[PDB]
Amino acid sequence: NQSSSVEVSSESYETIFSQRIIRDLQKELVVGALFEELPMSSK
Amino acid sequence: ILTMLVEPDAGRATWVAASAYGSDNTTGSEVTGALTEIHFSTYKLAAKSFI
């Protein structure tokens, strides 16, 4: 703040750190799971 | 001001001669003294701060 008579050590003590993680929009997946599956038990 | 009284210093007597044993000097001499004074005062100390 650096405006009153007394000041804090640095901006680390003027800050609140949050453990919240947020993500943007991700491309939707379409072809990954639209076909039927053919299981195998050999090469 | 707070003022106090100072006692003066010392006087002294006189050695009268043998002739003045009947005259008026038999009493000796007069010793006088005057008192004195002392004075005290104060000073102001101050500071300020803001938030």
Automatic annotation (TrEMBL), chain B:
Q: What is the lineage of its organism?
A: Viruses, Duplodnaviria, Heunggongvirae, Uroviricota, Caudoviricetes
Q: Where in the cell is it found?
A: Virion
Species per Swiss-Prot/TrEMBL record: Escherichia phage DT57C
Say which residues of the entire protein are included here.
205 to 255 of 458
TM spans, by residue? Answer: none
Where on the tree of life does the source sit, at the highest rank? Viruses
Its recorded name reads Major head protein
